Amino acid sequence: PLAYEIWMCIVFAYIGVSVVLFLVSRFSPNEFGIFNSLWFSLGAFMRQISPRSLSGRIVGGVWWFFTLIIISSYTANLAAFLTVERMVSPIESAEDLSKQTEIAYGTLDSGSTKEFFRRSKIAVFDKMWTYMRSAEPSVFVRTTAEGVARVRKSKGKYAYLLESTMNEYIEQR
Amino acid sequence: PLAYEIWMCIVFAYIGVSVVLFLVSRFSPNEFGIFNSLWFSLGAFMQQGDISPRSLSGRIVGGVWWFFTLIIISSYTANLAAFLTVERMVSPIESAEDLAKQTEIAYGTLDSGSTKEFFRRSKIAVYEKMWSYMKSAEPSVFTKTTADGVARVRKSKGKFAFLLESTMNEYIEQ
Amino acid sequence: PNEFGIFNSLWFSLGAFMQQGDISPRSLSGRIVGGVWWFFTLIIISSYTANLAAFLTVERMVSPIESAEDLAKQTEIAYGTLDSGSTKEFFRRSKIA
Amino acid sequence: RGVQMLLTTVGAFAAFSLMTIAVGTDYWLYSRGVMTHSGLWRTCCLFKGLCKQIDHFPEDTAEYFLRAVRASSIFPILSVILLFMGGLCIAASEFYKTRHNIILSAGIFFVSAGLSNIIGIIVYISANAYSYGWSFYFGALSFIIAEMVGVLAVHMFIDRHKQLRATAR
Amino acid sequence: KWWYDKGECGAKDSGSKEKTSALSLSNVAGVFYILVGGLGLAMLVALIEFCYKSRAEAKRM
Amino acid sequence: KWWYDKGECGAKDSGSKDKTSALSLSNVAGVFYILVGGLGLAMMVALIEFCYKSRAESKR
Ligand SMILES: O=c1[nH]c2cc(C(F)(F)F)c(N3CCOCC3)cc2n(CP(=O)(O)O)c1=O
Numbered sequence: 001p002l003a004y005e006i007w008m009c010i011v012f013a014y015i016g017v018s019v020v021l022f023l024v025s026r027f028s029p030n031e032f033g034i035f036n037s038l039w040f041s042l043g044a045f046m047r048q049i050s051p052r053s054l055s056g057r058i059v060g061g062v063w064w065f066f067t068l069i070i071i072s073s074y075t076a077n078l079a080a081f082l083t084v085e086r087m088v089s090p091i092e093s094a095e096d097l098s099k100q101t102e103i104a105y106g107t108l109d110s111g112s113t114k115e116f117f118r119r120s121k122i123a124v125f126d127k128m129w130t131y132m133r134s135a136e137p138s139v140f141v142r143t144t145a146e147g148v149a150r151v152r153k154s155k156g157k158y159a160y161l162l163e164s165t166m167n168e169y170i171e172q173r
Numbered sequence: 174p175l176a177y178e179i180w181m182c183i184v185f186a187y188i189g190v191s192v193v194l195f196l197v198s199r200f201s202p203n204e205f206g207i208f209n210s211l212w213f214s215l216g217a218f219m220q221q222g223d224i225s226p227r228s229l230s231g232r233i234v235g236g237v238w239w240f241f242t243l244i245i246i247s248s249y250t251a252n253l254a255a256f257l258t259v260e261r262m263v264s265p266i267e268s269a270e271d272l273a274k275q276t277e278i279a280y281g282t283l284d285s286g287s288t289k290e291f292f293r294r295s296k297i298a299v300y301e302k303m304w305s306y307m308k309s310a311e312p313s314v315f316t317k318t319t320a321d322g323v324a325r326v327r328k329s330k331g332k333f334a335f336l337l338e339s340t341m342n343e344y345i346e347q
Numbered sequence: 348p349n350e351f352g353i354f355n356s357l358w359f360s361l362g363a364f365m366q367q368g369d370i371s372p373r374s375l376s377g378r379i380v381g382g383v384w385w386f387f388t389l390i391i392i393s394s395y396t397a398n399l400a401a402f403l404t405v406e407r408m409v410s411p412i413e414s415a416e417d418l419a420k421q422t423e424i425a426y427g428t429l430d431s432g433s434t435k436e437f438f439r440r441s442k443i444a
Numbered sequence: 445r446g447v448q449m450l451l452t453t454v455g456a457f458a459a460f461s462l463m464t465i466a467v468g469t470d471y472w473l474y475s476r477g478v479m480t481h482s483g484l485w486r487t488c489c490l491f492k493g494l495c496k497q498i499d500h501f502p503e504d505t506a507e508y509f510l511r512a513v514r515a516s517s518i519f520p521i522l523s524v525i526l527l528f529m530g531g532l533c534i535a536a537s538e539f540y541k542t543r544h545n546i547i548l549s550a551g552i553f554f555v556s557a558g559l560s561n562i563i564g565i566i567v568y569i570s571a572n573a574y575s576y577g578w579s580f581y582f583g584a585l586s587f588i589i590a591e592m593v594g595v596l597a598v599h600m601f602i603d604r605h606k607q608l609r610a611t612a613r
Numbered sequence: 614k615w616w617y618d619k620g621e622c623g624a625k626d627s628g629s630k631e632k633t634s635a636l637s638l639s640n641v642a643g644v645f646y647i648l649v650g651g652l653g654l655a656m657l658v659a660l661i662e663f664c665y666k667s668r669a670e671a672k673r674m
Numbered sequence: 675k676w677w678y679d680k681g682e683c684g685a686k687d688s689g690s691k692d693k694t695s696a697l698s699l700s701n702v703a704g705v706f707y708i709l710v711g712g713l714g715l716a717m718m719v720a721l722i723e724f725c726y727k728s729r730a731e732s733k734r
């Protein structure tokens with residue numbers, strides 16, 4: 001939750017505030033030391049020694065409020081993910097089959113669907129027919145219920161294409 | 174999630190309690206300084222904390238301020254959790270039953286045409302309720318032209334909707 | 348040293364296990380073991396907080412069945428009538444969808 | 445020495461002046477059925493130009509008690525009276541300082557008056573249930589200056605107590 | 614038709630109950646009140662204890 | 675040709691992903707901004723107070 005890229009921003013801000021705290025604490029002529037300042041920044045990051053320079057203590061306090069807001073928002077966003085649990089489908093549009101190749105897709109071995117994909121003029125469907133006609137292994141199923149059992153035993157790896165009415169009928173069973 | 178005005182009162186109570194600490198710590202040491210009193214007030218304001226007092230009065234001022242701001246930031250946590258729970262609520266409109274299930278966002282059709290004749294001569298009770306809403310709206314939701322309905326939806330910001338053909342909707346979408 | 352005792356090590360492990368805490372170490376290795384264990388159990392008890400919040404959010408969900416549209420809106424809890432009677436004739440000869 | 449006392453005196457004077465300006469007018473602003481200003485006793489709209497006393501106290505017992513506190517400004521008027529009494533005590537203790545113990549009671553009364561002013565600001569904020577006027581910011585800044593002047597006054601008091609303890613030995 | 618559908622109340626036990634309110638100050642005002650009460654209590658207790666300490670120091674001499 | 679290529683809109687890609695099923699970033703950049711601002715402010719205050727302390731100590 002809350003970050004897929006901003007974790008590196010958190011770590012970089014941690015190292016930067018550690019450098020600022022060491023620059024304040026170890027330049028006044030106790031709490032000095034690069035490992036001591038880094039471990040005090042670690043102690044400020046999570047919950048559980050204090051500086052007395054009254055200028056880097058402001059840095060420690062604003063970082064301390066900063067990571068408090070971070071862990072509060074972390075608790076809130078983790079509760080938000082645990083609350084709704086509305087997982088979505090990976091495929092939305094018709095170009096998604098052209099966009100990826102991990103989850104496979106196929107049609108029936110014989111019928112007007114294969115002639116539609118074969119005699120198509122759209123380059124997207126041309127790439128679809130090139131992928132399905134050169135698929136390894138053969139994605140073509142014999143009957144409709146064989147394709148239904150192929151999709152139901154795929155666990156999100158292979159899909160089947162057919163008419164919309166039959167698909168919506170099987171969807172309601 | 175809380176406000177933009179309670180925070181100034183929180184800062185005012187913070188600096189007031191720091192004034193209390195700098196008063197009473199110098200009225201009976203370690204918290205003799207103004208930065209010492211302000212720093213202990215900051216440590217009492219957050220969860221964690223440094224320099225432990227030993228007096229009755231300073232510790233009871235800390236106990237007053239400290240559970241206070243504990244309940245405040247716990248309420249901040251719960252309020253932000255509630256706002257993010259709001260953030261992943263109900264999906265947008267995707268069916269006519271979604272239109273029948275709500276009443277906040279209004280909708281309309283064209284004032285004339287076989288579109289209005291479809292709802293007027295309907296038999297499905299959902300579309301019959303739709304025509305009951307459109308025939309008894311206050312004021313009239315009907316526009317004279319198509320572009321009038323387009324401008325009515327564009328000046329709504331999520332308050333009025335329009336029903337039309339799918340090809341015309343996909344063309345005006347593009 | 349300060350954490351020479353087994354109770355000292357167990358007490359600092361207890362302090363690192365919770366949020367708050369006492370006796371600060373000074374070594375590289377002890378502080379990095381604390382940093383490994385401490386953010387770990389931080390994420391654990393934060394997940395406990397969020398999980399209990401999710402369970403209490405479940406605890407105040409949807410009210411029980413109060414209308415026939417409530418029966419039509421669900422499919423988990425089944426329902427039935429008597430095998431014969433004007434009750435079954437009411438549903439058989441109905442006009443409301 | 446005397447420069448800090450004169451700074452504390454002019455800070456108390458400026459705080460009392462801003463408190464009087466907060467009592468006077470333009471305390472809050474709320475768009476009524478056009479905008480309008482208010483000073484916790486009457487409202488003035490932006491016909492136009494007229495003013496009227498809109499401090500209507502009627503339309504558990506805790507809501508009625510909170511409405512009774514918010515009506516007629518019980519907290520901030522008595523807070524301003526306590527600030528005036530503390531300023532008079534500071535002016536009486538500035539010249540002919542016979543006893544060195546009334547300054548602590550004057551500072552305690554001044555800090556308690558500031559705390560009552562903050563409590564009255566909390567009551568006036570809770571009675572609002574969209575922007576704010578100038579006199580609310582002026583009262584907040586006067587609270588800041590009063591807190592700083594109280595810190596300076598108790599600092600001068602502990603310096604005088606340390607001087608008395610050094611001269612008595 | 615003439616009761617559930619003819620009227621203007623299209624709630625019909627609506628699930629849409631978003632109500633995106635941040636926070637009321639009524640949850641904050643009494644907590645401010647008990648804050649000010651605790652602060653005044655601590656002020657008066659500290660004043661009477663230092664007054665008794667000064668009286669005992671003057672009586673002990 | 676006439677509904678998709680003739681049109682003045684882009685591809686139907688709601689954007690990066692399908693919807694906002696992921697991390698928030700909106701408050702994150704602003705709290706980063708106020709952290710950088712407070713960091714630079716406290717850094718310049720520390721610099722000027724150490725300069726004043728060095729000027730007081732070098733001149734006794
Ligand atoms: O004229 C035709 N009418 C068809 C009618 C149907 C349906 F009505 F849906 F039963 C189907 N199926 C599609 C999926 O469910 C199983 C059979 C196939 C048909 N085909 C073969 P196509 O060449 O693949 O279209 C025809 O030729």
Ligand SMILES: O=c1[nH]c2cc(C(F)(F)F)c(N3CCOCC3)cc2n(CP(=O)(O)O)c1=O
Nearest residue numbers: 283285286287288289290319337338340341342
């Ligand atoms: O015979 C009819 N043919 C129609 C053909 C079209 C178009 F799609 F442009 F070809 C449209 N529009 C679709 C919506 O935006 C305005 C124009 C309306 C038509 N109407 C009026 P309706 O009765 O309201 O459908 C007819 O009567």
Ligand SMILES: O=c1[nH]c2cc(C(F)(F)F)c(N3CCOCC3)cc2n(CP(=O)(O)O)c1=O
Nearest residue numbers: 427428429430431432433434435436437438439
């Ligand atoms: O004429 C009829 N009079 C009925 C009178 C009653 C009673 F209420 F006890 F008086 C009942 N019951 C109500 C339910 O529990 C079992 C007995 C059933 C009746 N039925 C059968 P229905 O057609 O299923 O209503 C009739 O036919």
